[PDB]
Every structure is written in C-alpha cells, then in structure tokens.
Design an enzyme around this catalytic site. Structure first.
Site, PDB file in Angstrom:
ATOM      1  N   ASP A 240       5.025 -18.901 -74.678  1.00  0.00           N
ATOM      2  CA  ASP A 240       4.061 -19.391 -75.661  1.00  0.00           C
ATOM      3  C   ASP A 240       3.971 -20.913 -75.597  1.00  0.00           C
ATOM      4  OD1 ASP A 240       2.967 -17.531 -78.291  1.00  0.00           O
ATOM      5  OD2 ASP A 240       2.746 -19.714 -78.475  1.00  0.00           O
TER       6      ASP A 240
ATOM      7  N   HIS B 109       2.307 -22.417 -82.936  1.00  0.00           N
ATOM      8  CA  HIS B 109       2.118 -20.991 -82.675  1.00  0.00           C
ATOM      9  C   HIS B 109       3.387 -20.351 -82.109  1.00  0.00           C
ATOM     10  CE1 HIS B 109       0.521 -17.558 -80.254  1.00  0.00           C
ATOM     11  NE2 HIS B 109      -0.369 -17.439 -81.222  1.00  0.00           N
TER      12      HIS B 109
ATOM     13  N   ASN C 102      -7.740 -10.528 -80.364  1.00  0.00           N
ATOM     14  CA  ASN C 102      -8.343 -10.721 -81.680  1.00  0.00           C
ATOM     15  C   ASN C 102      -9.868 -10.682 -81.643  1.00  0.00           C
ATOM     16  OD1 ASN C 102      -5.616 -11.254 -82.623  1.00  0.00           O
ATOM     17  ND2 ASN C 102      -5.826 -13.312 -81.726  1.00  0.00           N
TER      18      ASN C 102
ATOM     19  N   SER D 192      -1.173 -11.975 -82.342  1.00  0.00           N
ATOM     20  CA  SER D 192      -0.034 -12.799 -81.965  1.00  0.00           C
ATOM     21  C   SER D 192       1.134 -12.626 -82.923  1.00  0.00           C
ATOM     22  CB  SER D 192      -0.392 -14.283 -81.962  1.00  0.00           C
ATOM     23  OG  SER D 192      -1.256 -14.631 -80.906  1.00  0.00           O
TER      24      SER D 192
END
Length: 279
Positions: free
Chosen positions: A39, A69, A161, A224
């Site tokens: 990530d 994130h 998403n 996520s």
C-alpha cells in the site's frame, strides 16, 4: 477475549447478528503470523501498532506513509484497538506514492518481493498479504497475485469501488486469490462495492474507524477497508491452526455468515466474514 466498544466491523466479524459493539476473539490473536500490507506504507511509530509494525520495502524516496491509506488498512489488520489480529506482525511494502497511485510494474514487483521476502521473516503460523488497491484488468497484475498466492501467502485483494462487476479490475479478477467486497453496519452491500462471480467474501467496509498518520484515527469507507478485515481474519485463523494460506479464503467462505446481506446481485456470493469464535 472481549473488546468492548469496538469498531462495528470488528464486532460484526465475531457476531451472528449486526448491531452489536463488542469484538470477541481467541487471545492468541494472530501471534506468530505475519501480514504484509502492500500500500502507501505504514506509520509504524503509531502507538496502536505497539512495535509490531515495520516497513520492509519502498519503491519511492521514503518508506513513510505520507497519505494515511496504508496506515488505516494496517490498523484494521493488526492494531491494538482497531485490528482483527491484535498480535500479528505487520510488514509494510510501499508500492503506492503519497497520492495513493502506483504503476502496475511497481505493484507487480512488490508482490514478487513479498513472495521472496517471507523467507527472510519469522512467521511460523503463516503469511498473509493484503492488497487494498487495483485498477483496470491486467493479466500481468493478476499473474503476480497468482504467483504470490502459489508461493504460500494468503492473498486478499479489494474488489474495487466502482459498483460494477469486478471481472474488469485487477488484481480483483484473479480467481486464485481472495477477492473481498464491502458491506455496511446494517448488512447492506456497500453502495460503492464491486460485485460479481469472482468475489469470494464480503467484509465490513463502510465507515471503518482505524489508525491514521500523525498518530491519529479516522473513519473512511471502501473495499480497501473490507480487505484488511479478511486478511487479519486469515492470520487469526492460521494462528489457531484452523486453516492454511492455501485454503484460508475457501475456509472463510465455508464458515461465513450466509445469506445475511441485502442488495447482493444474483450470481454474487452472499457471504460475510465471520470468525466463529465461541467465547
């Protein structure tokens, strides 16, 4: 063990019902497992990680999480308050820059890195990789995720998403990994969650509280956020000896809460991650 006033998603994964707020789990808590968070990095100095997080690789000028994130996802895997597997070891691999973007070639290199690097780590109970990232369909990206899984790592990936079929996104569309959709606290499919035949499981993804950079916390939403619930659950179950890296996705589906989600399209699994912990 019981954690009162837990984030709703933790409570959800140890419950047969929505609407409760205590997380119940075996105290082994993923001890002896390892989870790679591929990530934007991890703010490993956050008190919530208790020294159990470290950066092992970056492809940029710093290994710092300048975005948040990656720290949020790592917190859902394994932070003391916001995590599923509160004693796992967390390894950060920074394939995404501080804007949250990354080239597929860097993402591929990071996956191949983890497949090798686990041989440099102590993970007697097994190894997991959490990939809260994706883009358009790429056979090369999917093959990288397939190799990582084949090498003995439980690979969990975000479905995406787009409120669309995950077949057109990668690594979501790789069949051999664990593709995770998102649900909300009322057991509805999250409004943004991708769906489709390739999904293996749903996890909590709307309004998920976790760690953030600057030693902070916040609540955000996405597949996520669902993915690290499943990654942490895998690590927890592997520590318990209930499953292996090769079979953990199938085992999580086998033992999931079945038929409890609403607005699941015909042909998508109606399976919500569940630890089946009996206190």
């Amino acid at each position: 063990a019981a954690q009162t006033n837990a984030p709703w998603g933790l409570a959800r994964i140890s419950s047969t019902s929505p609407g409760t707020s205590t997380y119940y789990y075996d105290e082994s808590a993923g001890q002896g497992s390892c989870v790679y968070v591929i990530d934007t990095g991890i703010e490993a100095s956050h008190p919530e990680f208790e020294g159990r997080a470290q950066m092992v690789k970056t492809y940029y000028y710093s290994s710092r999480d300048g975005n948040g994130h990656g720290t949020h996802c790592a917190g859902t895997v394994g932070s003391r308050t916001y995590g599923v597997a509160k004693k796992t070891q967390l390894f950060g691999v920074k394939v995404l820059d501080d804007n949250g973007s990354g080239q597929y070639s860097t993402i591929i290199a990071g996956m191949d890195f983890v497949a090798s690097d686990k041989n440099n780590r102590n993970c007697p109970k097994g190894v997991v990789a959490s990939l809260s990232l994706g883009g358009g369909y790429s056979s090369s990206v999917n093959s990288a995720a397939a190799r990582l899984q084949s090498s003995g790592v439980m690979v969990a990936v975000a479905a995406g998403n787009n409120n669309a079929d995950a077949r057109n996104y990668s690594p979501a569309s790789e069949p051999s990994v664990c593709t995770v959709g998102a649900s909300d606290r009322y057991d509805r499919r999250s409004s943004f969650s991708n769906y489709g035949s390739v999904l293996d499981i749903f996890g909590p993804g709307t309004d998920i509280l976790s760690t953030w950079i600057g030693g902070s916390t916040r609540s955000i939403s996405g597949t996520s956020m669902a993915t690290p619930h499943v990654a942490g659950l895998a690590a927890y179950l592997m520590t318990l000896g209930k499953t292996t890296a090769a079979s953990a996705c199938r085992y999580i589906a086998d033992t999931a809460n079945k038929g409890d989600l609403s607005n699941i399209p015909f042909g998508t699994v109606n399976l919500l991650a569940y630890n089946n912990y009996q206190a």
